[PDB]
């Protein structure tokens, strides 16, 4: 995260850490959805063009820190995975469209203070909150400049853009499955996801039963907090199929 | 590295 | 079931320092 601020604690109880074996690094953010399932960007696993290939065996989950680097010793827990899915229609050639994948956990994990899972939305409640204007939260343990590492989980609020500005920000082709968020040069207020943020959540607080739901997965960027530019969004809801999907199929 | 050590019994929960 | 009801927070009626920027938003 580039201008955020230090997370309160357990103001992120679904944040996730994905952790490399070895060597020990942090490889992205990533969300509990359930005491057995986590979610996170597929370009975290698999990215050819750059030789990127995780397997199950090649990492680690990490859920309840704090820290980014300390093993927090009675407040995180460490798991294997059992299984990665990766959306069969995943982009990874041209725009990253459909930058999601399952992760299912070897055993489930017990909710305490700090791990807590968040909501996944519902049709109705995509269609009130993801709004123009309307902001969300994004957390992660990512750099803190686009050119370092914090000590401590950063949050930064973001206000979703509209589908045109996003449009043309950039050369590449943006899809339904995608949303932007970010300040406008002209709002002088800045902020942005970074590198090792990826493949975390985009939140909002649902102002009607007030509960907190997933709207985006961190997905890519140009930069970070570049003016007139603008962080993109995995869209939670238009992939729940998917997700249902495979959980009904093969899990929790 | 940077990353403080945990223990092989540390992991699955 | 118990989804994003969180356990120092929501769960006993305190609130997070920039959570009213977001319901504002709204």
């Given at each position: 995260i580039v201008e955020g601020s230090d997370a309160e604690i357990?103001?992120?109880?679904?944040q996730v850490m994905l952790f490399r074996k070895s060597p020990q690094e942090l490889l992205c953010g990533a969300s509990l959805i359930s005491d057995r399932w986590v979610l996170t960007a597929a370009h975290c696993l698999l990215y050819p063009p750059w030789d990127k290939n995780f397997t199950e065996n090649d990492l680690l989950v990490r859920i309840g820190?704090?820290?980014?680097?300390?093993?927090?010793?009675?407040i995180e827990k460490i798991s294997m995975l059992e299984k990665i899915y990766i959306?069969?229609?995943?982009?990874?050639?041209?725009?990253?469209?459909?930058?999601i994948a399952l992760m299912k956990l070897k055993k489930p994990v017990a909710f305490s203070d700090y791990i807590h899972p968040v909501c996944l939305p519902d049709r109705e409640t995509a269609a009130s909150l993801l709004q123009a204007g309307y902001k969300g939260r994004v957390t992660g343990w990512?750099?803190?400049?686009?050119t370092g590492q914090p000590s401590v989980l950063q949050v930064v609020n973001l206000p979703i853009v509209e589908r045109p500005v996003c449009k043309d920000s950039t050369r590449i082709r943006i899809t339904d499955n995608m949303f932007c968020a970010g300040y406008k040069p002209d709002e002088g207020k800045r902020g942005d996801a970074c590198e090792g943020?990826?493949?975390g959540p985009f939140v909002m607080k649902s102002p009607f039963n007030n509960r907190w739901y997933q709207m985006g997965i961190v997905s890519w960027g140009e930069?970070?907090?570049?003016?007139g530019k603008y962080g993109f969004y995995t869209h939670v809801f238009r992939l729940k199929k998917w997700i249902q999907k495979v959980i009904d199929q093969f899990g929790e | 590295s940077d990353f403080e050590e945990f223990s092989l019994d540390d992991i699955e929960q | 079931a118990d989804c994003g009801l969180r356990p120092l927070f929501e769960k006993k009626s305190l609130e997070d320092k920039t959570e009213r920027e977001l319901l504002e938003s709204y």
């Open positions: 357990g103001m992120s109880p679904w820190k704090h820290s980014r680097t300390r093993y927090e010793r009675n959306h069969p229609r995943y982009n990874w050639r041209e725009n990253l469209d459909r930058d990512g750099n803190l400049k686009e943020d990826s493949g930069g970070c907090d570049r003016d | - | -």
